[PDB]
C-alpha cells in the first residue's frame, strides 16, 4: 500500500533527513589517539590497540545507550585463547563485572566465574581501575568514547532514516 | 512416587479445572475486526493480515503478561512483498481517559530480516524515548493505516486475556495428570 | 606488558589470598543431607537426586549469588519416569525461608529454555495451588532444611572460586 499517510510521511522524512544532513555537513567521526583503531559491524565498534605483549580491545553496540556499556577484553600474547574481561557502565565511568573469557568465543560462558563489584573490595577494584588505565582505558578515553558513540548514533540515525523513506515509499 | 500430598493435589485441581472451565466460559472468546487470523503455538500468538503489496504481523507471548487481564508486549512486522528480504519492525506495549492518551505506544522500531535466526543486535534500533514527536505521530499513523490502532490494541488485550485463561486450564490439566501418574 | 602498577597489584593479590585462605580453611564443603550427589561445572552446580519413579535435580550458578553469604536462585526439575520426556520446573529463591517464582513442563534434557511453553508466574497466582507447590516440593526432598544446606553450600562454593579466581588474576597480571 501507499496510502495517503504514507505520502505525507515521505515529505515529512525528507524534509528531516534535510535538516538532519544540515547540521552535520561540517561533522566527522571524533578520532581518538593512543594507537587506536576502529572497527564497524553495523551498530557495534570495536577500538584495538596493541601494546608490549598485549592487545586491547574495547567494544560497544550504539543501540539504547549516548553513553554505551562498553566491554574491555585484555589479551596477553603469552596464551592468546584467554583474555581478562571487563564490562564497564556510565560517578564517571565504572567495571560493572570481571572474568576470564575464551578469546573469540563464539558466545558467552556463564560458567565462568565472574566478579560482580556491586560487593567488591574497595582496593581491589581501584587496582582493576588501575590496570586499565596503564592500558590507555580511563576517564579520557571514556569521554572520549562518549562522543564516539554519539556521533555514530546521529550518522547512523540518518542512514535509518533515509531507509524508512524508501521503505514507506516502496510497493 | 505418589504421595498423600500428591493425593491431595489432585483433589485440589480436578475440581479447579472443572470451576475455572464454567467460568470463563461465557467469554464466548473474543472476536477481531480487520481480518486478522491467529496462528498460535503454544503460548506464542501471531495474528497475521494481508493487503495490497504486504503482510502484516503482530506477535506476542502471553507469559508474564500480566502486571487477570493480560496486556503483554507486542511486536508488528510489517513485510513490503518487493522485499520479502526484510521487514520494518515495531517493538510496543501498554503504558503502566485524556484526549492525547493512547493505549499502547511504540517503544522501539528496526528493520530485521524476515524469519532471521533471531533479533539482530548489529541493525540500527531506535528508541522513541526522545523521539521526535511528528516523525512518532507518522509512526503511529503508518501502523493505524495497517490496522494496528487503538481499537485493535483493546481487542488484544481481550484476546490475550482469554488465551491466558484458556491455557491456564490446560496446564492445571498437564500438571494433574503430571501428579496423578506413579 | 608488566608495568609498576601491575606488579603492585600482583603484591596486593598474594596478600589478598592469604586473608581469603586463612579465614576459609577451617570448614570442608558443607554435606547436602537426602542422599543429593553434587556435580560441579564452573560456577554451575547441580545436585541430583533419585527416589521412587523419578529423578529429581536442581540446579544453580554462584554467579551474582551475593563474610559474604550467598543465597541464588535455584532451579528445581522433577522427571517422571512415566514421561520422561517432558519436566516439571520451578525457579525458586530466597526472597518460609524460599519462594517459588515461576513454573512450568519444559523438554528433558533440552539445550535452551522454550519459551513457547505455558509459565505460571506465582506473582499472579492463588495461595492454593501455592501451597500444594511448595508440599509437592518437600515430599520430594526440596524443603527448608535443603534451602538452609543450599546456602551453606553455594557460599562455601563462592568463596572457594573466589579464591580460585584471584590467583588467576594474580598470575595473569604477573605474566608478560
Known sequence: ???????????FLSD???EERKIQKHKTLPKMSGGWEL???????????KVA????????????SSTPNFVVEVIKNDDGKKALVLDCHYDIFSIREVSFQ??????????????NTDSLD?????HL??????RGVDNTF?????????????????????????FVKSQ
Not at 581501575?129 to 596503564?134: H, I, N, P, R, T
Request: charged letters at 30%; aromatic letters at 10%.
Open 129 to 134: 581501575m588501575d590496570f586499565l588505565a596503564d
Open 102 to 115: 575464551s578469546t573469540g568465543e563464539s558466545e558467552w560462558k556463564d560458567t565462568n566465574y565472574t566478579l
Open 53 to 64: 605483549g598485549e592487545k586491547i580491545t574495547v567494544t560497544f553496540n550504539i543501540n539504547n
Open 122 to 126: 574497595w582496593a581491589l577494584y581501584d
Open 142 to 166: 571514556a569521554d572520549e568514547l562518549v562522543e564516539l558513540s554519539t556521533a555514530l548514533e546521529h550518522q547512523e540515525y540518518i542512514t535509518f532514516l533515509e531507509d524508512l523513506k524508501s
Open 1 to 11: 500500500m501507499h496510502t495517503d499517510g504514507d505520502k505525507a510521511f515521505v515529505d
Open 39 to 49: 572497527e564497524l559491524n553495523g551498530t557495534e565498534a570495536k577500538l584495538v590497540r
Open 16 to 18: 528531516e533527513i534535510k
